């Protein structure tokens, strides 16, 4: 009966029963296969770990992520994640429960089609639906209009919405997100004499990104002041007990979102991207979007990110408009909470792709029914 | 993964005429050497090993000596053909021609068998 809400984003998988207020399980979408020959016959059985085991055993495992830039890249590993999700993490069998999946905009259609085929053929679900991740974030706010900004692990994208009408031509997307910010940190720590290179250690560099990095409110002032004193020189422990300590690297990574030329990409930053999308919207909508920027996704958690973004748009937009940024405290879960609300909605109970419709039309049905 | 997928790549009338040395002198008239043919090379040998087995040991000395230098080099290529699939005892005769032929031709007549790029 009850629907399942399953945010198969890159980075962290999130799943749970619809109508619940926060996920029942979240774990990393990683598949870990052993990098040494399996030789302690006995307990050392498993040939491929998934999720929290793989994250824990990472010392002996070559971790890999099966979603790259929001595009599923290894379907056999992805199937293992879903299998892990249903039978091990939620402990509810799929055959009785319709599933709300969710996806980033402008993904290749082959992603959406095969994801559905796997759902009906392998897990044998009653029905399913594929919402775009941005509008789910708008539901979570209790909001009728706004410009959504999801910044995931692998995709950042803007979707503007007015009176619940979407504006497809104004949807725009950037393939820069929490992963490449981590890979850049994994370079600039070499300037200081550390070195992280193995796939397991990339999990440690992610950890320090979460705890120490912050967005500069005035980057050039921050650079000049960082050169003055050790006042920024925060310290952190590796699992080996080695101690590392960091200065201006704290903000240079977050700043990549606003200056993609650090990682050599030519696109404008998230601030100029947001404004560019509003300039594509119809003119009388614009005033109301400025009051309802809604941030979503973990990459928007950095200290001061709401203020920095407000400053940039306030300078860039007409000076009479009142720019405000909706940054919910729980915005890390915004996409999943939004799905939980949609899957409870009395109108939505008609919108499922029901099994017989796929049995009729095949995988292509997703383009008929889904947004 | 990637490294798996390789990239980078008339005689009878002379025999029964008694002076059968005149047959062998005639048997060397049918070399298939220059041709691309393969069934003919199987015919060419059979027309000669039938001759080689006919000789008495009183004659196998002169039957070599009466050849020219090309004749000996020609003969050695037929000798090394019969060794590739002997008859029930004919190796006993090829090794006896070989004795005489190598005496006349020396090891040099072997070397231009080993280096022969086209053959009977």
């Amino acid at each position: 009966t009850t629907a399942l809400v399953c945010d198969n984003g890159s980075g962290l998988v999130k799943a749970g029963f619809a109508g619940d207020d926060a996920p029942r399980a979240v774990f990393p979408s990683i598949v870990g296969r052993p990098r040494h020959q399996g030789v302690m016959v006995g307990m050392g059985q498993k040939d491929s770990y998934v999720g929290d085991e793989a994250q824990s055993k990472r010392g002996i495992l070559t971790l890999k992520y099966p979603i790259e830039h929001g595009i599923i890249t290894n379907w056999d590993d992805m199937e293992k994640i879903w299998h892990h999700t249903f039978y091990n993490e939620l402990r509810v069998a799929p055959e009785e429960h319709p599933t709300l999946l969710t996806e980033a905009p402008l993904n290749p259609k082959a992603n959406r089609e095969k994801m559905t085929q796997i759902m009906f053929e392998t897990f044998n679900v009653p029905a399913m639906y594929v919402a775009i991740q941005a509008v789910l974030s708008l539901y979570a706010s209790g909001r009728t209009t706004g410009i959504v900004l999801d910044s995931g692990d692998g995709v950042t994208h803007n979707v503007p919405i007015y009176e619940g009408y979407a504006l497809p031509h104004a949807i725009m997307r950037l393939d820069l997100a929490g992963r490449d910010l981590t890979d850049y940190l994994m370079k600039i720590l070499t300037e200081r004499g550390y070195s992280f290179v193995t796939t397991a250690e990339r999990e440690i560099v992610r950890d320090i990104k979460e705890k120490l990095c912050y967005v500069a409110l005035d980057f050039e002032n921050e650079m000049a002041t960082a050169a003055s004193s050790s006042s920024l020189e925060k310290s952190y422990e590796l699992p080996d007990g080695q101690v590392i300590t960091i200065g201006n690297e704290r903000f240079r990574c977050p700043e990549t979102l606003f200056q993609p030329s650090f990682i050599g990409m030519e696109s404008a930053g998230i601030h100029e991207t947001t404004y560019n999308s509003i300039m594509k919207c119809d003119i009388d909508i614009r005033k109301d979007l400025y009051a309802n920027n809604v941030m979503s996704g973990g990459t928007t958690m950095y200290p001061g990110i709401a203020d920095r973004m407000q400053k940039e748009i306030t300078a860039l937009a007409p000076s009479t408009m009142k720019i405000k940024i909706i940054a919910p405290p729980e915005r890390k879960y915004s996409v999943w909470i939004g799905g939980s609300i949609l899957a409870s909605l009395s109108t939505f109970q008609q919108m499922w792709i029901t099994k017989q419709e796929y049995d009729e039309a095949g995988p292509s049905i997703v383009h008929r029914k889904c947004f | 993964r990637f490294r798996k997928v390789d990239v980078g790549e008339e005689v009878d009338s002379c025999l029964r005429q008694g002076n059968m040395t005149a047959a062998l002198q005639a048997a060397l008239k049918n070399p298939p050497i220059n041709t691309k043919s393969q069934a003919v090379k199987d015919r060419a040998g059979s027309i000669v090993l039938k001759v080689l087995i006919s000789f008495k040991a009183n004659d196998i000395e002169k039957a070599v000596q009466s050849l020219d230098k090309n004749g000996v080099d020609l003969l050695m290529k037929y000798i090394y053909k019969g060794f590739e699939s002997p008859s029930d005892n004919s190796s006993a005769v090829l090794l006896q021609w070989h004795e005489k032929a190598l005496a006349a031709g020396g090891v040099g007549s072997i070397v231009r068998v080993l280096t022969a790029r086209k053959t009977v």
Binding site: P34, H36, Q37, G38, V39, M40, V41, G42, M43, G44, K57, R58, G59, I60, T198, A200, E201, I204, S230, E233, S235, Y236, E237, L238, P239, D240, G241, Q242, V243, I244, T245 | -
Partner: protein, 411 residues
């Protein structure tokens, strides 16, 4: 199958025989074979080569240590088998006399010393499949079994599946790290110091000082004092000062029996007690060309292992094989490591201005009663399992491939 598999562990000092599933090896015997001898009837015309059935007059084990009329040979050296003729005669009598096993009807688990060359794994497989027609063989890494013996013995709350094992048997010492059930093959180290060279060092050290020891029995008494009186000391030069000042009492007496005359003889036992075990800590005492203390070889292993597993490896070091039994051998290695590790953290404190203090690494070195046969007991608990019978090579695989089915090794 119904009949149990055989587990035969062969070392350079001892071999350890029995059927799987038993709790304990059914024979412990020295790795010696006493072949028949002649008054130079073997000579330049032919050396040690037999005729008729003259080759079957030999014995192995303790049945071969004390026979007068036979030449004792020791086929295994540095763990590696050196003379396969004698080893094959050794294997036959193990099977058809000591084990009573029919090779054609019992699986064999047999042990690889982690140094050995692949050719020796071909030849050992050629014996069991082509000489004896064993239905299936498995070649086990000795260190991983030693860890499994600790694992099943130790309390379930700390069955970590993670640790460094030090396996100082005779021959060569292996230091091997296992993380969560996988051998980290890249980090394995071999130290040449072992029970034989400690014996030899004591033998020379006696023969220079204590002549009166009869040449037939020098080796026996050197082994006795090693086993009965020797200990790892607290500070090398401080013992020499104690042995000078209290020479009335740190000096000891050993009484031996003359094997030929049955007269007793006595020797004073002295500096032998702490030299020897300290060869593990000063390998240059016994070898020209090894020098890192065992307490600094084991550090390099963990420091080459992946960063996450490093601390757990320090928390669980397991001691294996007979030479690790020396008094205080654990206490000193733990002290040396602890003194190294927390000093290393003292550097990274200062490079961060004391701004954060790292959670210090605790180091543990663990001694457990299995030490004299943990390799076999691990082997028995493996070869009991129904899983084991599928990891083994079935005999047909030796037919379809060559003996090459044993070329592979996990290093």
């Amino acid at each position: 199958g119904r009949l149990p598999a055989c587990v035969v562990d062969c070392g350079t000092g001892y071999t350890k025989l029995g059927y799987a599933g038993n709790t304990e090896p059914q024979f412990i015997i020295p790795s010696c074979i006493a072949i028949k001898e002649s008054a130079k009837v073997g000579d330049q015309a032919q050396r040690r080569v037999m005729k008729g059935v003259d080759d079957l007059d030999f014995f192995i084990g303790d049945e071969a240590i004390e026979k007068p009329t036979y030449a004792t040979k020791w086929p295994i050296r540095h763990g590696i088998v050196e003379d396969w003729d004698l080893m094959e005669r050794f294997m036959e009598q193990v099977i058809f006399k000591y084990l009573r096993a029919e090779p054609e009807d019992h699986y064999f688990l047999l042990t690889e010393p982690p140094l050995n060359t692949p050719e020796n794994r071909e030849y050992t497989a050629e014996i069991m499949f082509e000489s004896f027609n064993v239905p299936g063989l498995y070649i086990a890494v000795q260190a991983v079994l030693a860890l499994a013996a600790s694992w099943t013995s130790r309390q379930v709350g700390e069955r970590t599946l993670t640790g460094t094992v030090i396996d100082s048997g005779d021959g060569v010492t292996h230091v091997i790290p296992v993380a969560e059930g996988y051998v980290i093959g890249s980090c394995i180290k071999h130290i040449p110091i072992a029970g034989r060279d400690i014996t030899y060092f004591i033998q020379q050290l006696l023969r220079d000082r204590e002549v009166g020891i009869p040449p037939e029995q020098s080796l026996e008494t050197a082994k006795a004092v090693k086993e009965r009186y020797s200990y790892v000391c607290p500070d090398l030069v401080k013992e020499f000062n104690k042995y000078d000042t209290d020479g009335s009492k740190w000096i000891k007496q050993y009484t031996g029996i003359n094997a030929i005359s049955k007269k007793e003889f006595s020797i004073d036992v002295g500096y032998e007690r702490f030299l020897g075990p300290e060869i593990f800590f000063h390998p240059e005492f016994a070898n020209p060309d090894f020098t890192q203390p065992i307490s600094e070889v084991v550090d390099e292993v963990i420091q080459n292992c992946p960063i996450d597993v490093r601390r757990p490896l320090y928390k669980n070091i397991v001691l294996s094989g007979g030479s690790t039994m020396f008094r205080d051998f654990g206490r000193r290695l733990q002290r040396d490591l602890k003194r190294t590790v927390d000093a290393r953290l003292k550097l990274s404190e200062e490079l961060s201005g004391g701004r954060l203090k790292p959670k210090p690494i605790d180091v543990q070195v663990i001694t457990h009663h299995m030490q004299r046969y943990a390799v076999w007991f691990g082997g028995s608990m493996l070869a009991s399992t129904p899983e084991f019978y599928q990891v083994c090579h079935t005999k047909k695989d030796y037919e379809e491939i060559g003996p090459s089915i044993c070329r592979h090794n996990p290093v």
